[PDB]
Amino acid sequence: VKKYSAGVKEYRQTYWMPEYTPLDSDILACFKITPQPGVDREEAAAAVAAESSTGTWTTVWTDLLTDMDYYKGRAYRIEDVPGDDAAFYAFIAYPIDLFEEGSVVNVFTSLVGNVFGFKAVRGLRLEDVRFPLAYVKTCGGPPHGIQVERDKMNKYGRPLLGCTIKPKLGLSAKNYGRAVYECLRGGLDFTKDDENINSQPFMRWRDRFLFVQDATETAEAQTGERKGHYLNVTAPTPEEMYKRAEFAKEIGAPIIMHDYITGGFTANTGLAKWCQDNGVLLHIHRAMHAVIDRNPNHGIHFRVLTKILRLSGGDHLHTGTVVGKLEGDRASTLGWIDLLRESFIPEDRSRGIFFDQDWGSMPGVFAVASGGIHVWHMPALVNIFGDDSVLQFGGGTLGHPWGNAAGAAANRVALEACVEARNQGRDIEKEGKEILTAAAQHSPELKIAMETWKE
Amino acid sequence: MQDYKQSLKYETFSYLPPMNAERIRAQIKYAIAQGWSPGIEHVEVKNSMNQYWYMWKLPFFGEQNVDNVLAEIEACRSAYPTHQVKLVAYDNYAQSLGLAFVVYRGN
Amino acid sequence: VKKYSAGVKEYRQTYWMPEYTPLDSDILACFKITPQPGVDREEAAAAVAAESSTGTWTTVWTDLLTDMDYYKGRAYRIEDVPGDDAAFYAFIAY
């Protein structure tokens, strides 16, 4: 358009470009639109493209001051949703110039800011986002990544083992350290603060960090293996968050943890840069993901949140446990684990991967499994996740009949037996019981652990 | 309740019973099957936690024969009978070790 | 190369990839090489590629710790210099 004509106009006239070929620099988004009957697909797609980028509900003269053809987001492909005729996939291209470089915040705000509120759609689901390599290079990414972390902690050949201290709340700092000490001395690589553990009247953070570090060092001396505890630095303000991170560095804590959604992307990105500058590993908890990621018709798929975390920065990311998930959602889970860890993920619709995602040199992130998992889950966990994973057994350790040290040893024996059997070429999931039963003959801890919880 | 007895450990597989020749052989074979280069490290027991153990000769880049690896382990053991001895497998694609485990515990 | 063999080796064997197609992420350099008579073009191009990136005058075992195929710079095209037969353009991808 070259002349200014005021009034309301249809989004399709400008934001639906079926013949557009996305550039390599473009950010691409796949939205699953469940529109209200009566609204046209192209118009729904164009409306999402316009409102997420440069469009307005009515024509504004200021558009003529700039070149909307260059800047505008454009819907370029419509596809059916397999097996769901109420919904369709809209593919929208966004010029890279629309986004602040190195800002997952800005890109996220633009894509999810207000399109989710449209009365035209019954539901809007952001399925996938193609971050071009040019954008990826502007982002800090994981402060260390899988390989650097293994070198720093001198851990090779197996998944790492972790435990969340339980109960989630209520323990004093000294008792918290006692629980940490017992878990670590028994064979866990890591222990962690619960996501809810920040600084509470029952346990102030500085007291917690001191006792935990004492526990970590004592266990490390007594086992001859490196140990860590993810100290939660999630805090009310950035100043408080950095203060806690600095104290962890000062006392020699190798790893800290943060809640990137609840704490927020701005805080997380700053923390990730701080972690890289100070050599501290960063474990990321995904609290609130289920609020946003569960509903298949409305929200954001976790795979998108996974990509944002890798760009924002974390050395570990909580990924849930595939054991609970059904086979339909298993392939999707394997999909985002590849996104978390691999360098190049090719497009694969069966796994929910709508775009080729190139990470280039950006390091991979440890996948973290947790939940109500215990020794019996070990074979399936080792199979699904592989070596570059952290398996966290909170209840499965502190709930052992003989205490944390025995529970840790039971999990450690189960893990090592599964790994040894895998390396020998056995099908660990098929032979899981036999493997665990054989290992239990040499470990009373594993034996009673297998009796405590059911297969 | 049984009391858990604290003792020093040696990382991967150290919580399992000590490996016979067959178990050790299977791990080396797996490493070669992955395309990893086996290597041997050794160190004085008190220095076990150092980042840099002594390297025995060079990593056996492209070694396909597990018997050669086992012979090297014996040769390292003979040269340094009090040292702990660790088998490693270099993964040049990840520039990390694919596996590492202590074959002899030292002293 | 998978095994370590010490000694001096020709740069061409590794750093001259006439069939390489540069990636979009690659940094490309065009050098006008005026070589001394007796030296081969490809070897001159490969030598520039090796020394500007990952190469060494002699074989080092540490190469085997990493993946030189991924990291190495590679000369991928040789062209004549129009009107100057003493010189040639070497195109190297990094």
């Binding site: 899988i146 390989q147 860890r341 691999e342 360098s343 190049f344 080729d356 190139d358 280039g360 390091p363 991979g364 570059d388 | 993964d91 694609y93 990840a94 520039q95 990390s96 | 990636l23 993946d67 991924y70």
Partner: peptide, 9 residues
Amino acid sequence: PRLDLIEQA
């Protein structure tokens, strides 16, 4: 891992 399955490969 890492470099084994790059886009170039």
